[PDB]
Amino acid sequence: MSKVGINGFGRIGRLVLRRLLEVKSNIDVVAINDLTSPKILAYLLKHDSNYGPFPWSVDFTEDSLIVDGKSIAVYAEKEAKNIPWKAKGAEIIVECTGFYTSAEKSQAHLDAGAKKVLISAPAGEMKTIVYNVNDDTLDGNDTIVSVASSTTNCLAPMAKALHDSFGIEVGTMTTIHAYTGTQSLVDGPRGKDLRASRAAAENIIPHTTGAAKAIGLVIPELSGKLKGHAQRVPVKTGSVTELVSILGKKVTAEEVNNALKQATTNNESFGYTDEEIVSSDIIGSHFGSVFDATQTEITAVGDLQLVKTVAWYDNEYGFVTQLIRTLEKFAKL
Amino acid sequence: SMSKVGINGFGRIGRLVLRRLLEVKSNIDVVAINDLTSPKILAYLLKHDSNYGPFPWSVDFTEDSLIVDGKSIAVYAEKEAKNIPWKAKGAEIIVECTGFYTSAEKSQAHLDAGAKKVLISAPAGEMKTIVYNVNDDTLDGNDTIVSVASSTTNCLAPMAKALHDSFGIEVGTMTTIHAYTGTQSLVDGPRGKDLRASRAAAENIIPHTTGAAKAIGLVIPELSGKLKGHAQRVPVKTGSVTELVSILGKKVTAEEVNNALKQATTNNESFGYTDEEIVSSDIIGSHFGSVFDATQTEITAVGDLQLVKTVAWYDNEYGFVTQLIRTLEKFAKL
Amino acid sequence: MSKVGINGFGRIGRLVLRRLLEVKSNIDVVAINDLTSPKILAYLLKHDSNYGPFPWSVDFTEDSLIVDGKSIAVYAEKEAKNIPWKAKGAEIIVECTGFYTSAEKSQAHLDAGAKKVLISAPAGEMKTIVYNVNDDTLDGNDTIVSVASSTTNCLAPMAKALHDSFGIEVGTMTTIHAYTGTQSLVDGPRGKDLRASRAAAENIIPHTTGAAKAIGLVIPELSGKLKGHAQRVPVKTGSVTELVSILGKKVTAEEVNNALKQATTNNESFGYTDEEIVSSDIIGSHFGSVFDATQTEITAVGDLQLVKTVAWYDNEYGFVTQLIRTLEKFAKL
Amino acid sequence: MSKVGINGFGRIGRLVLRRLLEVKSNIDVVAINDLTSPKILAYLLKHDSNYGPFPWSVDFTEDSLIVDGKSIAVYAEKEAKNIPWKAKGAEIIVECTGFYTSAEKSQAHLDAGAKKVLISAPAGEMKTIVYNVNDDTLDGNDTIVSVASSTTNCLAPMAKALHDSFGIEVGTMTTIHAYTGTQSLVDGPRGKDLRASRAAAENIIPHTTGAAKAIGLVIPELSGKLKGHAQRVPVKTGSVTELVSILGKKVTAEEVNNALKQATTNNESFGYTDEEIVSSDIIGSHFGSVFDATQTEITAVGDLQLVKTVAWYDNEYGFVTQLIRTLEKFAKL
């Protein structure tokens, strides 16, 4: 129950291991499952187009990685129920494949002899945790838990702060979001999301996301009160979420900013800036969300007020630092 | 009827002004261009376009002109508009596309230089400002200097107008996810006093101020002071999209918003409609100023509190230019 | 008026149809096979990130596309031997999937009832045609033919002219090549080519190509004289091929250029330019190769001389016009 | 000497400071000249699109930056004449504006009271240093010296090693090169050069470079033996140079790679890799040049032999490391 396996050694999977080693975690990654050879997983861990060289040694054998001198078994089981997690005693699986985003599906890791699963994505009605918003809802008896999306991790601490300070009566969100591997390099079939079939680095691409709609799992009072969507655009990582709200009180911009500032104080998960940053400045962030005071906008006509608030997020590494906080707590229950 | 035009600033917008005029076989002839460079360079840029490809007509040049589709066009290189020799070829209406004369005070220099009227391809303060097929009926014979606002305004205005007319907009805020432009930076480095504009445009999402919502009263007077907004500049070369979040004057469904918008786009050469799952590159070369996208419409309601998000695409280069040219053609016949 | 089937309606497959309709070809495309529904293929045909809206109407039914009012059967058979090509009498298959690049594999289209197959890629030791270089080697007995890569179609007309005018003693090629669907959007496994696993829009990526090595299939006398490779870079289409040769004769730049110009005169496949063009200027090219006199370079020391020649190609549409020319001829034999 | 001015606080200028600080140099930057406000230079230093957050604290006043608690004056003089280098005690001027690339032009820095100038670019016929190739050519009487281009620092070490082991009889280079500030963001005039007028992030753009032409200043025996050019491509930083040589001996690939390995052994300026890297893996390199053994290629037809050797380079930071290496030495004579 400090021994971990990773299913899906992709962008998130590899950064999970990077982060665990960065914080000198007591968690022990003993096994990795993907679809490929150790050779290829080794090369991918060693060379990262977004974060540069792996800061530890990486080698491999025909069935393992050796990362900073320590051996990690590598399996290639496309069906999670066949992953031999018991061989090295992997107890908590960090599920990062995208193919097991529900209770029913991730049960397969427990049938395969793990005790717990932390899914790196929304997964329906199950405990969904944004760290430093609702991580106190985790419980010793939880075996399958979600950390939602990157987008949820960015939205939630902002929504929580506005909710606690002013009340959110209704709101809508748009994230301007880096492209991800669910999109396409060249125009071509991508299941049945038509917009996902289009070349991701050459287009602005609207895309659905549940971040707003499922916010009730993280902040129950906001349940049903938000909606939203993304526009996927050609940056490799680093994204930004705008929320437009009718609040429960009349406010000034200074007041909103000051409230947010207070909520980020002593908060390892939720950062604040008033610097004129742009997306690349978020890359490598150790926050799940960085509230940007410079973009706060209050639109007012007589009685009526609309409030736009904006937070940056590194949808890869930043979200990953959240996934790890949640994992470290999950392992100790 | 005024047939003869001068283009000042033969840049992204100015070159496409020519392109579009020839494409529609306008009776308007471009008789002179002014910029800061040589005919050879302007001819190279006209002939080869990174966004729309090869010019569809022949391009050659001489020491002091361009020859385009067989027709000669004078080239001047006067950085101050008052010195442009517009009377040599009888340039009557100036399409002002440099970014440097974005006021009545500034653009009236073209009149001092012998022109009769000026059409500014950008916002230009509190002057007559036209979005074609929203408020072009406010143009008259006494208008001598006119603005066509920003392409962001040409996107926002028709959408806002349809909504104003059908339901009312009590208050709204806009964000445009906007293609990068020449006002931005290639590599991180100073760009006047806007810190964000200093950053590498093709490697960043860059918040950016725009006045499209702020100054919407110039085009739709009843919405004056009711809208704000900003842009997120992103790494696409052209093609942009504008989201507006409104409190409307009436309780609505999405279907009802989409139908109202559809009716407003019917027989409207400036304002298109789509319910297809398009992306920004599908808007490149659009002949509309704005294309409303029914697939992105969103009603968020809790009790009596309702937010409505409406979304419209626009090719901030060519699509905008089609609107500029519609306004120009009308301007010239008043 | 021969009837054609297209296997693989991808970047090349869809542009094959676009080019046939553009030239008002007598060929009728009567069937398409891919892996997806008519609706997704209709979406992709209609909307193209590189070439804009389809110039003809496009609709679909549950088993067909309707393109400019003509019906094209759609099938979804991953094994070519199950494609019912006889149902609409497809007699020439344009093979564009990447999965049948040999005589032995493409035979499966003849087993399934077609008479000939034109493969849109290198396919080993078979007749391999670059139109206007070696198309006269085609005859009434050929049933399986390749058109090589777009790179071969760029390289061969330049090499052929140099060969004919000066002799090429030895040469090496580098193509700075737009990224394609064989690469990856984000860092992730891509078969066994390590470099192909890396984010294509964010890197310069060395990549092997057979264009130089197998050039002898197209220009027998240059067999074994050339090698080369690619650097894949972040442009969506539009590519350029450099060739550094030792020629059989001492030359000037002007002399090299005049010879190429001659070879491009009344040559619908091979253009010339002495304009300072860049890669977006080649997009939509109706040539397989455009020679660029501005980039010619003669480096000489004593009796020694290196000659660099450079030519542009739209690896998508330009190549496709070559493929269609070859197809037009192959259908008349 | 230990007191430096930087004229041109641009991509190179800022990184010069970053690198000095990273190596705990005993050299101290005491003044900076550019064309803007300390506020804007501070924003630029702190927030870097290529290298992320500055690793030391940055603040400013109306006449200064404060970097890691020390004060650095800031001037805004359009003409080097007018810079009070004297005031703050600026001995050596790192000239990084691109506007003073000759001995005569850089004279101003000495007229305004600096003792030496080190120019960050080629600067006509003057002492031009690639560190660990010809820095032994520097003496105490040197006042204005060049470190040439990024491309020169890539080409020179590789060329040097080949020349020492085998002889280069003639060669031509192509660098596939990240776009830089001399190019355009959108299509528009950029002085006389037509190709530089074109949108840099949307195009492959041929472009002249003197690296090969002027190699004689760094490696005198190669004077007039090399030529070359660049293809600028849409990556922000990270480049690669291919050189095709006729050597003075017959060689194998293994033999060429071992000679280069030897030349890179305990060579802090000149690295080696046999890993399958791509450009982004070079970002942040502490080498001026990294020879890539995986791309070596030998084309032999009897006595004739073309040898292609390929080296990577971070045209920003990698080049900067060499610039600082040279500076440290220049400052102690």
Ligand SMILES: NC(=O)c1ccc[n+]([C@@H]2O[C@H](COP(=O)([O-])OP(=O)(O)OC[C@H]3O[C@@H](n4cnc5c(N)ncnc54)[C@H](O)[C@@H]3O)[C@@H](O)[C@H]2O)c1
């Ligand atoms: N990229 C982001 O911005 C981001 C942020 C937060 C959460 N997420 C979520 O995390 C998950 C992974 O995202 P990603 O960007 O790392 O995806 P990715 O495509 O980079 O990685 C997926 C990995 O899973 C492997 N894989 C696929 N199917 C498999 C199977 N059946 N068994 C084992 N391995 C399999 C792939 O080979 C790959 O290495 C998704 O659920 C995604 O929604 C992504």
Ligand SMILES: NC(=O)c1ccc[n+]([C@@H]2O[C@H](COP(=O)([O-])OP(=O)(O)OC[C@H]3O[C@@H](n4cnc5c(N)ncnc54)[C@H](O)[C@@H]3O)[C@@H](O)[C@H]2O)c1
């Ligand atoms: N690009 C867009 O998306 C877009 C859309 C709508 C409106 N606009 C507006 O249109 C105008 C032009 O935009 P652009 O994108 O074409 O910019 P641009 O930089 O491409 O073009 C400006 C042109 O004007 C020339 N120029 C500069 N100063 C001059 C002077 N004093 N005299 C003569 N010529 C001069 C330049 O040499 C260049 O050719 C701006 O006002 C801009 O806000 C731009």
Ligand SMILES: NC(=O)c1ccc[n+]([C@@H]2O[C@H](COP(=O)([O-])OP(=O)(O)OC[C@H]3O[C@@H](n4cnc5c(N)ncnc54)[C@H](O)[C@@H]3O)[C@@H](O)[C@H]2O)c1
């Ligand atoms: N630059 C280019 O894109 C280019 C140029 C010249 C040649 N080629 C060659 O043309 C061929 C296609 O290239 P592309 O870029 O069009 O690739 P692509 O990936 O865009 O297209 C492949 C298409 O084939 C389908 N497909 C995959 N497996 C299949 C199967 N078993 N049966 C039926 N359909 C299947 C896919 O669904 C897809 O639509 C390849 O051999 C490639 O080397 C490509």
Ligand SMILES: NC(=O)c1ccc[n+]([C@@H]2O[C@H](COP(=O)([O-])OP(=O)(O)OC[C@H]3O[C@@H](n4cnc5c(N)ncnc54)[C@H](O)[C@@H]3O)[C@@H](O)[C@H]2O)c1
């Ligand atoms: N970027 C590279 O890859 C690279 C590599 C090696 C060498 N170089 C060379 O280094 C030099 C700088 O290149 P860069 O990429 O840093 O350029 P850049 O354009 O990023 O920076 C130049 C800086 O100088 C300033 N400037 C311009 N004229 C000035 C003046 N008269 N006085 C003071 N400041 C002035 C600008 O404001 C800017 O901050 C050039 O000579 C270039 O050839 C560049």
Ligand SMILES: O=C(OP(=O)(O)O)[C@@H](O)COP(=O)(O)O
């Ligand atoms: O909001 C705006 O949108 P456009 O005129 O649509 O491009 C303007 O501020 C920006 O245009 P510009 O940057 O080319 O001047």
Ligand SMILES: O=C[C@H](O)COP(=O)(O)O
């Ligand atoms: O799920 C989290 C992020 O918002 C991105 O999603 P994706 O990688 O599944 O496309």
Ligand SMILES: O=C[C@H](O)COP(=O)(O)O
């Ligand atoms: O130039 C050759 C082709 O573009 C490469 O095709 P592929 O990479 O899609 O196989």
Ligand SMILES: O=C[C@H](O)COP(=O)(O)O
């Ligand atoms: O404006 C300056 C560029 O960033 C410098 O690099 P370059 O001269 O090598 O193009």
Ligand SMILES: [Cl-]
């Ligand atoms: Cl929603």
Ligand SMILES: [Cl-]
């Ligand atoms: Cl004036």
Ligand SMILES: [Cl-]
């Ligand atoms: Cl505003």
Ligand SMILES: [Cl-]
């Ligand atoms: Cl804008």
Ligand SMILES: [Cl-]
């Ligand atoms: Cl088969």
Ligand SMILES: [Cl-]
């Ligand atoms: Cl080869």
Ligand SMILES: [Cl-]
């Ligand atoms: Cl290739």
Ligand SMILES: [Cl-]
């Ligand atoms: Cl040269």
